[PDB]
Design a protein around this ligand. Structure first.
Ligand SMILES: COC(=O)c1ccccc1S(=O)(=O)NC(=O)Nc1nc(C)cc(C)n1
Ligand SMILES: COC(=O)c1ccccc1S(=O)(=O)NC(=O)Nc1nc(C)cc(C)n1
Lengths: 349, 349
């Protein structure tokens, strides 16, 4: 159960670009304090870790953390149980885990000067945003309010400090450049499966439309829905009559159609309400967001697709949060992922 | 051999504190855009990865990256060869790699507002500093000027982009809080050996004075020297007759004396000039910095210690950069680390 046998492991950087400061670099002049003079900076590169089993079977999996997270969430649960990285190497797949540009070991583009600014150019915004513990608690559906847990909870209660410590801010790197780095990784790896989460859901759908090597997608609790341009369906506002879900991403139909060529599964945990819930903003947000995803999957299927929505409670798993792959039943969640890979032959050579 | 057999692996967060925004959190109100209202933020925590072999021998090793780096540098070289993590798990040690607070998967303390600012409080400075490619090239002694290599260089040429992509800024978290996180890790681990690098050199020395579990230190190319308070020896300026090395860190002699109780080795690569070199600021900086460290080690030995300076060229290894553990001969560098561990019984149970 904890033992893992690796034919090889390692990490590397991929993607990104360079930006430059003014002037020329003189090696005879004091190098410290650092200057933008004569400077070349590498920005927006992505960190990638890989672990390959002996005699892998089927396609490599690329695990893509959600918003404000890192590859840690696939390594271990907050209470130190094996994450999906270990579980899937044991299941004979080569496993890639990434820290996308702007997160963890990915690049945070800043220089000498106010955060994100290279002389007169704003690479990323100096003003940041970041969730609180309280905002994350309700976002991830630990309970309806901070400190509270849903009755059926699979959260590793007692490890709240570990869990919230894994979360942080993201600088304003364009989503285009985040997608670009993962497209480059997919080109490097070859045929593979993307396993996404929350904010990376929409990004992985975009990658698949740019990269035929994506042979399947499993998206845990995706945060933003995707539709063909001009064909976003009517989506209701939230129960507070004022808020809405995240504006759906729209792509050209030629690209959207590529989503119909591969198996796609969206996976949702528990405690998303059926009915409007004005007292709990994020619970209601999830209700309408899941609804929008159901319509997005239907649009894919009408174009010939193989898109499905898996509600974990319907599979007999109760109490999952928005991070089902780190919950107490994450081994059963992993079993359902293995089932999907087996159904489509993505676990065979 | 790239193969590794792990009895267990994983990662966790340790250390840090919390800061709070004003006001109250209302779950009925829109949670996004994120707000500091009612907010608790976890700040300055550290990420820790571990890999344990089957039947470990001796003490666990804690690999601590240098300035602007992450645990990536111990995982793989820029050209994809195994890093010290793999080499030492194969050498039957449990291996811990960290991303210290402010770097990689460690926390970057920022909120909703200008970078590093929580309402009226500056947690870290909004203005950042960061080396350029050019500054890092000369800092790490790839050659005397950017784009030029020493003839004897052990750097993995052709993988320059990959190498510089691993480097980034650090927010202004106090060194006290970085040391605090590692002291807490050392308390958690038990007896262990610190393996440091550059900026982490002085920090590891400080950790040892606070944590009796540190049973040995190997420091690759440490950047800041350490002395008892009031006993900093005369250190010359640089050849430019204007610049100085990093101000040596001073600690109370009762803490400094703890450094005499454990074996300590500082390891330096090649191409550090013996004589004043005014044309090449960072080469001359290393000349005087290495000299200051020699004096520091001497001070430890005058207190009954066992502190040594290992110049890799004297051991038959030519051309090493300031990252000997990722250079082309990093297996031979690793062998010298094994030799130190074996001499001092740190590879025995
Ligand atoms: C792991 O949890 C999630 O991934 C996740 C899950 C659900 C919702 C949101 C996220 S998030 O963290 O990615 N946060 C954001 O998307 N931030 C954000 N989005 C918009 C549209 C506007 C603003 C101001 N902030
Ligand atoms: C990997 O390379 C190094 O670690 C490394 C190696 C040599 C010199 C500097 C660094 S650095 O990157 O840490 N850069 C810094 O800016 N450090 C620093 N600067 C000041 C002004 C004071 C102090 C104490 N440290």
């Amino acid at each position: 159960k904890r033992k893992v046998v690796l034919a090889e492991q390692g990490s590397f950087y991929i993607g990104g670009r360079t930006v430059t400061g003014p002037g020329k670099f003189d090696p005879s002049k004091p190098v410290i304090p650092y200057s933008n003079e004569g400077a070349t900076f590498y920005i927006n590169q992505m960190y990638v870790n890989f672990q390959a089993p002996v005699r892998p079977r089927g396609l490599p999996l690329v695990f893509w953390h959600g918003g404000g997270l890192t590859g840690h969430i696939w390594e271990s649960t907050p209470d130190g149980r094996p994450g999906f990285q270990t579980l899937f190497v044991q299941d004979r797949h080569t496993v890639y885990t990434i820290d996308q540009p702007g997160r963890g070991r990915g690049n945070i583009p800043t220089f000498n000067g106010p955060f994100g600014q290279l002389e007169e150019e704003s690479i990323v915004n100096t003003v940041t945003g970041n969730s609180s513990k309280e905002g994350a608690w309700v976002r991830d559906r630990l309970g309806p309010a901070p400190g509270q847990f849903f009755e059926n909870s699979q959260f590793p209660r007692g490890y709240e400090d570990n869990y919230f410590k894994e979360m942080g801010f993201s600088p304003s790197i364009s989503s285009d450049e985040i997608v670009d780095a993962v497209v480059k990784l997919v080109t490097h790896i070859g045929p593979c499966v993307l396993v996404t989460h929350a904010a990376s859901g929409v990004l992985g759908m975009r990658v698949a439309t740019h990269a035929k090597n994506v042979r399947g997608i499993v998206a845990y609790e995706p945060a933003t829905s995707i539709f063909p341009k001009g064909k976003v369906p009517e989506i209701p506002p939230l129960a507070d009559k004022k808020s809405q879900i995240f504006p759906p991403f729209e792509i050209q139909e030629s690209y959207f159609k590529k989503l119909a060529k591969i198996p796609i599964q969206f996976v949702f945990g528990d405690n998303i309400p059926k009915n409007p819930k004005s007292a709990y903003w994020f619970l209601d947000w999830w209700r309408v967001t899941r609804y929008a995803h159901s319509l997005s999957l239907e649009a894919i299927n009408k174009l010939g697709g193989q898109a499905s929505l898996l509600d974990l409670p319907t599979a007999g798993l109760r109490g999952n949060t928005a991070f089902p792959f780190t919950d107490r039943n994450n081994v059963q969640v992993a079993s359902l992922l293995s089932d999907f890979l087996g159904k489509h032959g993505l676990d065979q050579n």
